[PDB]
Structure formats: structure tokens, C-alpha cells
Design a protein around this ligand. Sequence first.
Ligand SMILES: Nc1nc2c(ncn2[C@H]2C[C@H](O)[C@@H](COP(=O)(O)OP(=O)(O)OP(=O)(O)O)O2)c(=O)[nH]1
Ligand SMILES: [Mg+2]
Length: 217
Amino acid sequence: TEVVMENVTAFWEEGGTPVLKDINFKIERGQLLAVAGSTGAGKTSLLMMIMGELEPSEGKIKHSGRISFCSQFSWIMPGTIKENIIFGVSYDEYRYRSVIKACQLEEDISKFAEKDNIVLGEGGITLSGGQRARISLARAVYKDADLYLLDSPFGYLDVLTEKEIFESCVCKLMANKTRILVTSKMEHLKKADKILILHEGSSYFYGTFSELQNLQP
Ligand SMILES: Nc1nc2c(ncn2[C@H]2C[C@H](O)[C@@H](COP(=O)(O)OP(=O)(O)OP(=O)(O)O)O2)c(=O)[nH]1
Ligand SMILES: [Mg+2]
């Protein structure tokens, strides 16, 4: 197993209300877990526990190896689009190009005279929200890691573009990698190896899309 939570309860503030309550899941190496639920359910907090910024008050957590995290808030630092995606990692043309293509950024980049050397975050180009989200996702996916934590990475994208990048990047390009994707979309839950639906900190549902279908619903 690559990631396990067993009976996990946690608090952001000592003596407050628990942000996660008796959470249970297991991800094997190379699987995809979809984490769903309404605002404030605790999805980002769950990711924060995996990254060690929130310790459990009850229960056990297992995870090993380096993590690549994609925030639900897209961000850019001053530098070229290539520098923003590589972001200090060693450069490889094939790897970079595969990520760019999987994130539909090659069409964006091909339109600039400076191509991948277009400068962002310095007052020149002002990117759309969808462009910033895909750059942020590409940055997280380019990093080599054992576990990818993708927190609602499809912000500002229309539903078809989201579907295409979910398939090309999360399912195809990242097929061999252990992935936790915070997402609410039906196809993502259907393609995930496991689904965890959170509601106000608790496990609303945990299992497979097929199991949920068999309950009616
Ligand atoms: N005291 C404190 N509470 C936090 C913090 N971060 C989140 N919370 C609270 C707010 C919520 O009541 C609860 C869950 O917040 P989350 O950000 O984990 O929710 P989630 O990511 O599911 O919501 P989202 O879809 O991103 O709007 O925890 C924090 O850093 N400090
Ligand atoms: Mg969140």
C-alpha cells in the first residue's frame, strides 16, 4: 500500500470541531483516489495531513516518498512559461513536451513569438484563469514524485477541456503513478480506483463508483 488512513480524526484548532472524523482509505501503488465533497468538507485538509502539516488526533496514516502538490489556487512566479513548469527541476525536452501536450499548453505556447520563453508574472502577459490552472498542473506533473496530490486542478476550464486533460494527463500520462485527485466530476469518480466523499469532515461514502451504482442511488 502506498497511502493509508485508518480511523483518522484531526483538528486544526485544539478543542475546536474536528476537520476530519474517522476517515478510512487505502491506495495501492499506481492507483487513483478521487476525493469529493462540498466546500469545507475537509478535502484540502486531508491532503495537508498527507503532507505532514496536520497531525492526527486519532488513527494512523501511512505514506512514503516525495510528494508533488498542486494547489487549488493556481499561481505563477516571474519567469518564462518553461521556467514556471520546470520550476527548478532538471530539464528534459521529451518529459517537458509530454507534460505540455497533456495539459493542452502547446497550442497556447505556439501562438507566442517567444514560444516557451514567453515571460509570465512580470507585467507583460496577463494569463487567463484557465491558462494559469493548466500551467500550475503542468508544474506539479513535471516534478518527479512518488505521490501526486492534485487539489481541484481544473479551475476555469470548460467541462470538455477538463475531461480531455483529465484523460490525457491524469489517466494516460500519469498512468503508472499514485494519484489523489480532489474532484467532484462524475467521470473522474468513475475512472478512479477508489472514491472518498467527505461531508463536514466525515466519510459520506468510501468505495468504488460501481459499488455506489449498485446502491441505486
Ligand atoms: N483553524 C483553521 N481551520 C481551517 C484551515 N484550513 C481549513 N480550515 C477549516 C475550514 C473548514 O471548516 C475545514 C475544512 O476546510 P478545507 O479547506 O479542508 O475544505 P475543502 O478543501 O474541502 O473546501 P473547498 O472545496 O476547497 O472550498 O477546515 C486552517 O488552516 N486553520
Ligand atoms: Mg480545498
